Amino acid sequence: APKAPADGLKMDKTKQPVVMNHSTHKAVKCGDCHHPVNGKEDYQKCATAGCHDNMDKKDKSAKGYYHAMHDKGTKFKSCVGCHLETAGADAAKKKELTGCKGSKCHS
Ligand code: HEM
Numbered sequence: 001a002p003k004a005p006a007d008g009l010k011m012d013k014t015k016q017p018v019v020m021n022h023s024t025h026k027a028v029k030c031g032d033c034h035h036p037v038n039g040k041e042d043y044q045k046c047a048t049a050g051c052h053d054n055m056d057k058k059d060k061s062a063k064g065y066y067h068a069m070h071d072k073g074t075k076f077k078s079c080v081g082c083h084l085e086t087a088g089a090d091a092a093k094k095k096e097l098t099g100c101k102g103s104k105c106h107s
């Protein structure tokens, strides 16, 4: 079984890099993020070629990297989509977990 990596992982495909900590995400099944592809949970980097490798932030296809991290209504919850549900009606948590600036994702 693949093991979770160390905390402090940088996601740095873009000029707005974000740190991923697995320890804060333990309530989440591995395969909700490392989702099935062709019937098997895929643990490759999300922007691997053929995966979310389209760096146009307007793209909404299954290759759009921005889309996979930010949008609602996706087949697997995105960073922002899950965080919106987590924050609920709490505006402080909305700023912390979903704010586009001054949040725990983006300074
Ligand atoms: C669950 C315990 C779980 C495992 C196992 C796991 C593994 C894992 C690996 C091996 C990597 C490194 C991939 C590489 O080769 O660099 C990795 C990286 C990321 N993970 Fe993960 N992970 C588990 C759980 C979760 C959960 C619950 C999420 C989503 C909340 C998540 C997400 C990520 C992300 C993002 C990365 C970085 C990938 C990238 O930048 O391309 N993981 N994980």
Ligand code: HEM
Binding pocket: 033, 034, 035, 037, 042, 043, 044, 045, 046, 047, 048, 050, 051, 052, 060, 061, 062, 067, 068, 069, 073, 074, 075, 076, 077, 078
């Ligand atoms: C890396 C941890 C990673 C993330 C994050 C992630 C996100 C993601 C979302 C949010 C979707 C749904 C998008 C929607 O509009 O419905 C989604 C969908 C697919 N992905 Fe992905 N994904 C990550 C990793 C990987 C990897 C490593 C690949 C390539 C092997 C990949 C591929 C795909 C494909 C294909 C889809 C569509 C799947 C389907 O329709 O069943 N993803 N991902």
Ligand code: HEM
Binding pocket: 018, 019, 020, 021, 024, 025, 027, 028, 032, 033, 069, 077, 078, 079, 080, 082, 083, 086, 093, 097, 104, 105
């Ligand atoms: C997507 C790759 C993604 C990112 C990036 C991300 C970031 C993130 C941060 C920065 C925090 C704060 C704690 C920390 O610094 O590690 C945080 C917290 C929570 N997250 Fe998250 N998150 C990503 C994805 C997801 C997904 C897909 C879910 C749900 C399915 C999810 C959940 C949560 C939860 C719960 C927390 C804790 C909330 C807090 O304690 O108030 N995240 N994440």
Ligand code: HEM
Binding pocket: 011, 012, 013, 014, 015, 016, 017, 018, 055, 056, 057, 066, 069, 070, 079, 080, 083, 097, 098, 099, 100, 101, 103, 104, 105, 106
């Ligand atoms: C708020 C809705 C919000 C906005 C707007 C936003 C923007 C943004 C940009 C412009 C990028 C770079 C895109 C590019 O290719 O140039 C970027 C990248 C990432 N973001 Fe973001 N972002 C908003 C909010 C959040 C929140 C709250 C999180 C975390 C839950 C988050 C996550 C991510 C991730 C992951 C990336 C990619 C990091 C990288 O690989 O460089 N965003 N965002």
